[PDB]
Every structure is written in C-alpha cells, then in structure tokens.
Structure 1
C-alpha cells in the first residue's frame, strides 16, 4: 500500500455538511419577519425625509425677466418650497445694475416659521457634465500641493489648458478654467423689523481638502491665469493678486467633481442659531452665464435630516420590498392552505 490514497473526510468528499431546504415551515415566517421589520424602517425614513423644510429659487433668466425698478413676483415655474406652514407672500425678485456694467439679482422671500435647525445654502447646476472623461482627470495634482512644477513636467491631462504664450498656467486643467463665479452675499438681510441672518463661509469643503490644498510656492513672474480668469486677473498675476487655494474654499468645493449632470455645491451655512419667521433678502452677483452649458443655476436653502435632504427613495424602496414580501407571503399561504401539494416522499419517475 505505497500509493494508497489517504482515508480522510476531505480526500473522500464526505465532509460534515448541512443541506438547507426551502420549506413553507421556514420560508413564510421569513417573509413575515421581513415585512414586519421593513415597514417601520420605511415609515421612519419617510417621516425623516418629510420633516425636512427647504426652499429653491431658479434665479436664472433674472437678466431679462426681472424688473429693474421695483420688485415683481417670480413666475411659479421657478419656485419650490416645503415648510411646516403656509406662505402668505410668494418670493419676488429684482435686477440691480451698477455703473460699470455688473449686474446682480436680489431675491426676496419669506420664512413663515422658526426653523430651529442648521441652515445650509447651496447652488444647483443642471446639464453640466462634471463627470465627462475629458474633464474628470484634467487637473495636475502637484500644483494643488504647491510644488512649482516646470513646463515640461506638467501633466498632459490639461492638454488644452496647459501653458499659454510660453507661460505656465497655475491652475491646471479644465476643472479650474470653468468655475462657477457667482458670489452670494454672506448675509440674509431682514426686511421690515426682521433681523439680519449672518451666514459663514469657513469649513465647507471636506476636512481632507483643507489639508491637501496648500498655498502655492510659485512666483508671479512665472504663471498666467486661465483664459476664463482674465476678467478677474487682467494682464496676468502679480505679487498681490496671487491666490492661496488653502483658504479659497469655493475652489476646493468646485474641484471635488460630482457624479451626475445635476448636483449641489455647498456655499454658505449657519449652525449657531435659528432664523425666526419674517421676510429676508439675498443678493447674488450675476457673473456666470448659463449660455455656456445650457442649464439652470438655482439658489437652494435647506436643512439636514437623517439621510440628508428631502428624498423619499430610501423609504419607498423599503416599503416596496416589505409590500412585495407580504403580498407573496399571503399568496403562497393561501395556495398552501386551499391547495395542498401532496407530493409524496416515494413518488418519483427515477
């Protein structure tokens, strides 16, 4: 017995096993348990999503539709809101224009109840492909850290926006070249005995972006702004116009690309107190044109919930699963009771 195979449970394929069987003695109780545990979760999630009160104003087309003189009411196809009470006066808007030609949109809305919760101010963009293949990778990760990268050592992913007139462009790529540059006034001006609501701009992007985004080490005589930053920095950078992208948190927020053509970007927030009921006003500088991409930029004022925002999809999916399980459990139970199988243990065709 030299070449005799071993006599072990593994080698002989007789391991200790456990064969499960799908029996109505254990499948129907499983469906009952699923339908009993998924309906409370779905109800809780839908309640938590409904408990979120917010407001949204599509301030696009404020150039032509809004009135220059006095306030006119915004059309209904641009306003959305969800509060615990009714709104007596609908939001309105006005178009202010300075002497040099720069315009601004002044929105005037009303909060009917005290929102004893943290307030957040986002801007919403649509039909903007932040996830295009030619657009996600187009940025140099070394200049973000501040390293004075030479011209030849510059990444090729910025190929169209990579150096101009024999000068290096400091913010590489197309992600920084096309940046949303509409400025929200960092205060909600209260109108008629309404106190001002002071927002803030610090601590907005991820806690890791305030660690990788560091002040550049370049010198201004080497770098030149992108083609779409020339209006803010005419005739190139200087020793004072050079920005430090360590505290420029709007740049950090914009660089973190989104996954869908319709996305939010945090711009302002307040978490110290609530805003009581009353009429408020927000001024928005109109710099970024929507004819560049063909979408709709909007101002959004929200709060925070257990799942973030007002979204019913999670509770709806929980309820769909619970309902399907309960329905098929009832169907199988009645088919079992009114029509017994009676298959037989020794009933076979071999």
Structure 2
C-alpha cells in the first residue's frame, strides 16, 4: 500500500554516462588522423582509376558523314581513347551496304599495347532516359518466367503495347519494344599480320536473369511481335522463329533498366586470353537510328577496375575531404595560437 516511488538508477535518472568534450586537444588529432588515413586511400584510388585503358568511338552519323569507297579518317571530335601508349594512326571508318539496302558501318582502329586484363564491349547510348517512370516498370515478369498469360490477365503497365489486332502480344513491354539491335561482328577482325580475336556472347547478364528468364511455352498463332520487331521477324511468329528468351541473352541485358541517360549495356566479353596489339576492324549493322531518341550511340571497349572504369569521383571526394580537414585543423590551430580564447571564467555574463 506504500505509494513511495521506487529508488534505483533508472527511476531516478541516475544512470552512468559520459559527456563528450569538444576540446581542441580532442578535435585536432581526429581531423589530422582523418586526413592521414584519407590521403593514401585517395591516391591509391586515383592510381587504380588511372590504369583503366579503354576506348570509345561515336560511330553515329556513319550513314551520312562517312565515306563509301575508302576508309576516311574519323574526326577527333568523336574518337576518345586512354591507353598506356600514344596513338599513331587515326581511327577510320567506312560505309558498306549490301542487299535490301542493309547499310553497315565498318570501323577500324588500332590498339597500341597488349591488354593483359579481360576485355568488354558495350554500346553507350546518350539522352535515352531508361529511368523514366513510364519506362522502367512497363514490363510483365510472368511472361518472362514463361507462362501462357491470357489477354485479360496481361500486365496493366504495358498498356499501349498490349494485344495488337486482337492478338496477344508476346513481349508486352516498352523495354522489349525499343531494343538496341545493332548486331556486332562478335569478333575483332585483325588486319595486317594480326589474327582475329573471338569474343563470348553469352554469360553476360545477371545470374538471376538467366535463372528467371525461362523459355516460353506459347504456340505460334496467338502471339505477335511488337511493332519494332516486324522487320527481323516478318509474317508474325512461327514454330521455328519463336525466340527463346533463356538463350537470347541480349534481351536479358536490355531489360535491366539503367540509372542515368549516360549508361552502358554489356554486349560482348572475353575473359580467356589477352588482346594483342595491332589494327582491328569491327562491323556494325546500322539498324538503330539516332534520330529516334535524339542522342548519340557509341561503341565502347573497356577492361575492368577494382572500383569501376575510368572514373575519379571517389578519389576527388577523398581529396576534398582530406583538404577540408587539413585546412580547418591548421586554421583552428593558428587561431588558438595567435589569439587564444582566454574566456574559461564565467565572469557573471548572465
């Protein structure tokens, strides 16, 4: 019946604790230690990012601004390259067209040093916002897993490209429709006493993509290609022309929505042998027009880095942090030296 409150350490707010002191002796060592630990990490990161030796060729406008009878030089405005040695011969290009007006761009460049690391080949697309809200979520996953989804059970995200001419569209999705279809030569054709260099076309997407993208079980009279697939797959889908999304890995790579309009898309790779120096040639079937999205396509050949590939943002951020720390520490030190506080007493400033 005793209404006396308990007596302890918690009910009396008498818990043990520690109060942090912002004394300069407890602030300056912290900042100098942060600087001394961020400077080596920063220089190591910028050194690791310096070793990235890659190349990028803006092969756009090859249908109009490129020669036809011979390989004319590519303007320096487009070509970009970062190698251990200097480039002696300027990259060249030519326009070669065959039957049915199937134009193609033949690029020719020179690798001046043997690259020991593995090689990767992407296409960089600029001003193609994949992170758009109407673009990232507009694809069904059940049709990717491989099921005969009925017309009334289709995903509502792919609303415009849904059931054409009263026939269920197989790849209901804006990502599947606008697919990059510039077929690469799958091998770098060596020129002048230089052998070719084969490349791997599969095992490029994520593991979960290869594990989820299962071959469909549709027929051939109920599914129709999207409006952007009528050329390569004419007369609709058949029993043999029915694509297999489990092996067709480029489709799996393109479905992964990028983050910014300046992105890459893995197309070819080689991790089995080194790429020797010499002059190489690459054929690209000019099928994706740059006028559809207003940007600039580019063929990019890179290696691999412990952090990424030719980017110093981490290094410059480390350098900025270290510089701010080393500046403010010395500033406060000289401020307390040349003019101390001399205000430890209260002096009744109430």
What TM-score, normalized by structure 2, do the two folds share?
0.98
Q: Could you tell me how far 1:153 is from its partner in structure 2?
A: 0.5
Offset of residue 347 of structure 1: 3.3
DSSP 3-state at the match of 2:211: helix
Deviation at 1:138, TM superposition (A): 0.6
Alpha-carbon distance, 1:110 to partner = 0.3
Instruction: Output the CA distance in 2 between the equivalents of 1:282 and 1:347.
Output: 82
Q: CA deviation at 1:349?
A: 2.1
Per-residue CA deviation, residues 279-308 of structure 1 (Å, 9 max, x unaligned), is 000111111111111000000010111111
Q: How far did residue 346 of structure 1 move?
A: 4.0
Deviations along 1:8-57, one digit per CA (max 9) or x if unpaired, are 21111111110001111110000110110000000000000011100000
TM-score, with normalisation over the residues of structure 1?
0.98
- The Cα shift of 1:99 comes to 2.1
Which 5+ residue runs of structure 1 have no aligned equivalent?
A: none
2:347 & 2:298 partners in 1: Cα distance? 70
- Structure 1 residues 239 and 14 mapped into 2: Cα distance closer, same or farther (>3 Å)? same
What is the correspondence of 1:1-350 to structure 2 with a 5 Å cutoff? Answer: 2-350=2-350
Query: Alpha carbons of 1:217 and 1:129: their partners in 2 closer, same or farther (altered >3 Å)?
Result: same
Residue aligned with 2:280, SS: strand
Deviation, 1:345, is 3.9
CA deviations 1:320-346 (Å, max 9, x no partner) are 100100000000110111111111244
SS in 1 for 2:210: helix
Matches of 1:65 and 1:281, distance apart in 2: 19
Post-superposition offset of 1:186: 0.5
Structure-2 separation of matches of 1:49 and 1:348: 58
Measure the CA separation in 2 of the matches of 1:6 and 1:249.
70
Provide Cα deviations, 1:66-87, integer angstroms capped at 9, x if missing partner: 1110100001110000111111
Greater shift, 85-94 or 6-15, is seen at 6-15
Moved over 3 A (4+): 345-348
Counterpart CA distance in 2 for 1:247 and 1:149 is 21
Q: 1:285 to 1:17 in 2, by over 3 A?
A: same
Q: Distance in 2 between matches of 1:337 and 1:248?
A: 70
- Which has the larger displacement, 7-16 or 202-211? 7-16
Q: CA RMSD in A?
A: 0.9
1:348 and 1:191 mapped to 2: Cα distance?
88
* Secondary structure of the structure 2 residue equivalent to 1:250: helix
Distance 1:152-1:14 versus aligned 2 partners, 3 A rule: same
CA distance in 2, matches of 1:80, 1:333: 47
Deviation at 1:221, TM superposition (A): 1.3
Task: Supply the distance in 1 between the matched residues of 2:3 and 2:151 (Cα, whole angstroms).
Answer: 71
Q: Secondary structure at the match of 2:291?
A: helix
Mapped partners of 1:61, 1:119: distance in 2: 26
* Count of residues paired in the alignment: 350
Structure 2 distance, partners of 1:296, 1:263, is 12
